[PDB]
Amino acid sequence: DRAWRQTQLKVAELLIERQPEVAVGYRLRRHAVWAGITAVPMSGAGNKTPLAPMSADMVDEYRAAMNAPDQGLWQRIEQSLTLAPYWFEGHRLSAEVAEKLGFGAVAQAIAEELGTFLQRLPALRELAFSDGSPFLSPECSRWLLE
Amino acid sequence: DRAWRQTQLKVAELLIERQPEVAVGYRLRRHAVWAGITAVPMSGAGNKTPLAPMSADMVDEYRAAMNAPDQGLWQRIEQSLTLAPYWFEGHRLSAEVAEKLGFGAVAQAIAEELGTFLQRLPALRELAFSDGSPFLSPECSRWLLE
């Protein structure tokens, strides 16, 4: 399973490099990252999991850059999503970058894949990182619904 | 490149085998079969391309089996649409088996992927095999519209 995850991520990287505008490489990366998750993370009071939040400075850098997105930025957001599986805000940014680069079909696939994931594991919508920041903000939640 | 196609197919096969209810492996197979087609086949009179139609006995076998669909049937249909990339009727049948076996998300994904391919190459809607049978039957066409 660990090696399979790696095989899927390498194949996804190759698909994405070759055709940034094609959805399937992006979908395969989501499967690689998420398919192994069958139980939601344990949590204490307030549904706070003992998992580190994304660095808010790292997140502010990506936010800043959305005024002029490029592949470099998009790659960093994607890499962050692969390292931080519950950072759902990253999928919203990623789809926003896709949309701004003219990759409509990829933006849509990114929304759908997060929707599918959350349909399988709905309890994830209620959980937070160790600092009380939500996996899924009310903004990301509304974005997904829309 | 050939080895890339084969790599994609093997990954796709293993994703489908492990999780037959999960869309992404089916999607990966489509990309493998179709991504290298940027031009539609040449044709002569009657929009007949010089490509062999699917064996009618083979198709009669799959249709008869739709009475009691199983994994074996589904695999054969899938193998056939891998070997015969323009046999769109086979996607309809695949999605019908998916539906019947309770895999609705997969059925939907099969429809989406074919509509996507047809959006990229719309002249494929007007072509036929060497005996005049259409790449896209009116039945397949109606299924996509639904």
CA A43 to chain centre: 21
| Yes or no, beta carbons of A35 and B27 under 8 Å apart | no
Distances (CA, A) of A17 to A30, B11, B35, B38, B74: 16, 18, 14, 18, 32
Strand partners, A134: A128
* Rounded distance between C-alpha atoms, residue B115 and residue B129, angstroms: 20
Label each residue of B77-122 as H, E or C: HHHHHHHCCCCCHHHHHHHHHHHHCCCHHHHHHHHHHHHHHHHHCH
* Rounded distance between C-alpha atoms, residue B28 and residue A128, angstroms: 33
* Domains in chain A, number: 1
Angle of CA points A48, A66, A122, to nearest 5°: 30
* Rounded distance between C-alpha atoms, residue A103 and residue A105, angstroms: 6
Q: Is A141 helix (H, G, I), strand (E, B) or coil?
A: helix
Q: What tokens does A80 get?
A: 């962050």
For chain A, give the longest Cα–Cα distance. 45
CB-based contact B88:B117 (threshold 8 Å): no
Cβ atoms < 10 Å from Cβ of A99: 15
Interface test with B, best of A11, A21, A24 (most B CBs within 10 A): A24
| Yes or no, beta carbons of A24 and B28 under 8 Å apart | yes
Q: With residue B27 as reference, give the H or E element that holds it.
A: helix B23-34
Cβ atoms < 10 Å from Cβ of B127: 20
Cβ atoms < 10 Å from Cβ of A114: 23
Domain that holds residue A93: 1-146
| Yes or no, beta carbons of B22 and A4 under 8 Å apart | no
CB-based contact A74:A97 (threshold 8 Å): yes
Q: What tokens does B1 get?
A: 């490149």
- Tell me the CA end-to-end span of chain B in Å, nearest whole number: 35
Q: What tokens does A22 get?
A: 């094609």
CB-based contact B87:B80 (threshold 8 Å): yes
* CB burial readout A41-68, b (16+ within 10 A) else e: bebeeebbbebebbeeeebeebeebeee
Q: Is B128 helix (H, G, I), strand (E, B) or coil?
A: strand
**A19–chain B Cβ distance below 8 A for any pair:** yes
Cβ atoms < 10 Å from Cβ of A85: 18
Cβ atoms < 10 Å from Cβ of A69: 18
* Rounded distance between C-alpha atoms, residue A67 and residue B144, angstroms: 39
* Rounded distance between C-alpha atoms, residue B97 and residue B66, angstroms: 7
* Rounded distance between C-alpha atoms, residue A47 and residue A129, angstroms: 8
Positive or negative, the CA dihedral B77, B78, B81, B83 is negative
Q: B134 phi and psi, to 5 degrees? A: -75, 140
* Rounded distance between C-alpha atoms, residue A34 and residue A28, angstroms: 10
Strand partners, B128: B48, B134
| Yes or no, beta carbons of B19 and A8 under 8 Å apart | no
Q: Going by C-beta distance under 8 Å and a sequence separation of 6 or more, which residues neighbour residue B4? A: A14
Fill in the amino acid letter for A84. A
Label each residue of B36-47 as H, E or C: CCCCCCCCCHHH
Q: How many angstroms is the resolution?
A: 1.8
Q: With residue A11 as reference, give the H or E element that holds it.
A: helix A2-18
CB-based contact B87:B51 (threshold 8 Å): no
CA distance B113 to chain A (A): 10
Q: What DSSP string describes A64-122?
A: HHTTS--HHHHHHHHHHHHH-TT-THHHHHHHHHHHHTT-HHHHHHHHHHHHHHHHH-G
Fill in the amino acid letter for B131. D
Tell me the chain B residues in contact with residue A30 when contact means C-beta distances shorter than 8 Å.
Answer: 24
